[PDB]
């Protein structure tokens, strides 16, 4: 149990789950910013 | 001579519009980088 408490809920249930959704928002926002940069048509 | 002068005034402002576009793009990238925090 001392070996397996490394994977223990140190930061609590609410924070671990929220962090996951925060990273989801971060990753998705990175995705549309990068795709809008690649997809923009500056040239006439 | 007058005609020759017009040539350069036609050439210019294309670099200016490209420059304002790329400044807008880099400002947007910097803003996104600071807001993602």
DSSP type of residue B31: H
Contacts of residue A32 in chain B, CB cutoff 8 Å? none
- Number of A:B CB contacts under 8 A? 10
Nearest to B22 by CA among B10, B33, B14, B12: B14
Distance of CA A38 to the CA centre of its chain: 21
Substitution target in A22, A33, A39, A40 with the highest count of B β-carbons within 10 Å is A33
CA angle A10, A16, A17 (to 5 degrees): 150
Resolution in A: 3.7
Nearest Cα to Cα of residue B21 among A21, A43, A7: A43
């Amino acid at each position: 149990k001392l070996i397996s408490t490394m994977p223990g809920i140190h930061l609590s249930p609410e924070q671990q789950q929220q962090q996951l959704q925060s990273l989801r928002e971060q990753v998705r926002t990175k995705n549309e910013l990068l795709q809008k940069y690649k997809s923009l048509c500056m040239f006439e | 001579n007058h005609e020759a002068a017009t040539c350069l005034e036609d050439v210019v402002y294309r670099g200016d519009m490209l420059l304002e576009k790329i400044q807008s793009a880099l400002a947007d990238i910097a803003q996104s980088q600071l807001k993602t925090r």
